[PDB]
Enzyme design. Structure first.
Site, PDB file in Angstrom:
ATOM      1  N   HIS A   1       0.848  -1.168   0.000  1.00  0.00           N
ATOM      2  CA  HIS A   1       0.000   0.000   0.000  1.00  0.00           C
ATOM      3  C   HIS A   1       0.877   1.208   0.000  1.00  0.00           C
ATOM      4  CE1 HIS A   1       0.126  -0.173   4.472  1.00  0.00           C
ATOM      5  NE2 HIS A   1      -0.183   1.108   4.434  1.00  0.00           N
TER       6      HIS A   1
ATOM      7  N   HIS B   1       1.754   3.727   1.912  1.00  0.00           N
ATOM      8  CA  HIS B   1       2.261   4.408   3.093  1.00  0.00           C
ATOM      9  C   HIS B   1       3.743   4.093   3.299  1.00  0.00           C
ATOM     10  CE1 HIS B   1      -1.900   4.571   5.355  1.00  0.00           C
ATOM     11  NE2 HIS B   1      -1.760   5.564   4.488  1.00  0.00           N
TER      12      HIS B   1
ATOM     13  N   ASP C   1       5.792   2.776   5.478  1.00  0.00           N
ATOM     14  CA  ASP C   1       6.366   1.487   5.806  1.00  0.00           C
ATOM     15  C   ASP C   1       6.504   0.538   4.656  1.00  0.00           C
ATOM     16  OD1 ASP C   1       3.544   1.231   6.079  1.00  0.00           O
ATOM     17  OD2 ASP C   1       3.726   0.128   7.948  1.00  0.00           O
TER      18      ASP C   1
ATOM     19  N   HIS D   1      -7.225  -1.406   5.850  1.00  0.00           N
ATOM     20  CA  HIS D   1      -6.295  -0.470   6.437  1.00  0.00           C
ATOM     21  C   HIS D   1      -6.210   0.810   5.602  1.00  0.00           C
ATOM     22  CE1 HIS D   1      -2.695   1.278   8.043  1.00  0.00           C
ATOM     23  NE2 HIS D   1      -2.146   1.177   6.845  1.00  0.00           N
TER      24      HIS D   1
ATOM     25  N   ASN E   1      -3.817   3.536  12.813  1.00  0.00           N
ATOM     26  CA  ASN E   1      -4.411   4.697  12.253  1.00  0.00           C
ATOM     27  C   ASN E   1      -5.533   4.345  11.295  1.00  0.00           C
ATOM     28  OD1 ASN E   1      -4.884   6.894  10.461  1.00  0.00           O
ATOM     29  ND2 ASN E   1      -2.954   7.807  11.102  1.00  0.00           N
TER      30      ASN E   1
HETATM   31 ZN   LIG Z   1      -0.547   2.165   6.218  1.00  0.00          ZN
HETATM   32 ZN   LIG Z   2       2.170  -0.140   8.988  1.00  0.00          ZN
END
Ligand SMILES: [Zn+2]
Ligand SMILES: [Zn+2]
EC number: 3.5.2.6
Length: 214
Positions: free
Chosen positions: A73, A75, A77, A136, A167
């Site tokens: 995804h 983000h 990380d 997520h 989150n």
């Molecule tokens: Zn994420």
């Molecule tokens: Zn994560």
């Protein structure tokens, strides 16, 4: 141990990096596939520095080049190292939606080559990517190794110790259980589930994630 690798079997390892946030180490997992044609990662790391460190470590360990990364995804990380990937000619696979969100979240753009179900093969290593639905994030995918029944859940899948979804500002919390159900349906006899963060487990992680989402 800022970067660690841990073995699942000969050619499948988990990579884990500790991000540094507010003076706390925060582990993130991905996968390292040792194939006859190079190393393939599932996910990069939190940023370019860690991604470089990760790549340096795996390449040295296996004496093989990282050739491809699958981004689960958009983000940090997962995609944080995309600049490093692109400037190294390491292919950064993703769904089109992840690519769209990458561009929005200020990251360089991955390929957008993955569909809802995509089969890749790197040497003898078979890799399936699966978009199970929103959870997520809108775009989160999972990765499956059908030869070994290893599932990489990313942040869609919580570890056993996790009591918190994380989150959820851009999460689809209601839909997330359906997406997990879709993963549970698709992958029936799982040897290992790698959560986005925390200890590797088995199907129990999927059930646990469902439980958190109830
Ligand atoms: Zn994420
Ligand atoms: Zn994560």
């Amino acid at each position: 141990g800022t970067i660690s690798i841990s073995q699942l079997n000969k050619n499948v390892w988990v990579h884990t990096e500790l991000g540094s946030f507010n003076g706390e180490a925060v582990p993130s997992n991905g996968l390292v596939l040792n194939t006859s044609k190079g190393l393939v990662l599932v996910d990069s790391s939190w940023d370019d520095k860690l991604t470089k460190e990760l790549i340096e470590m795996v390449e040295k360990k296996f004496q093989k080049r990282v050739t491809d990364v699958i981004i689960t995804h958009a983000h940090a990380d997962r995609i944080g190292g995309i600049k490093t990937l692109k400037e190294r000619g390491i292919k950064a696979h993703s769904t089109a939606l992840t690519a769209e969100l990458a561009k929005k979240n200020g990251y360089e753009e991955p390929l957008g080559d993955l569909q809802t179900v995509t089969n890749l093969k790197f040497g003898n290593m078979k890799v399936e990517t699966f978009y199970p639905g929103k959870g997520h994030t809108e775009d989160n995918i999972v990765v499956w190794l059908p030869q070994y029944n290893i599932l990489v859940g990313g942040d869609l899948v919580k570890s056993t110790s996790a009591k918190d979804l994380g989150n959820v500002a851009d999460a689809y919390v209601n839909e997330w259980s359906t997406s997990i159900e879709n993963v549970l349906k698709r992958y029936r006899n799982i040897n290992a589930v790698v959560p986005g963060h925390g200890e590797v487990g088995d199907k129990g992680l999927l059930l646990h994630t469902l439980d958190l989402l109830k």
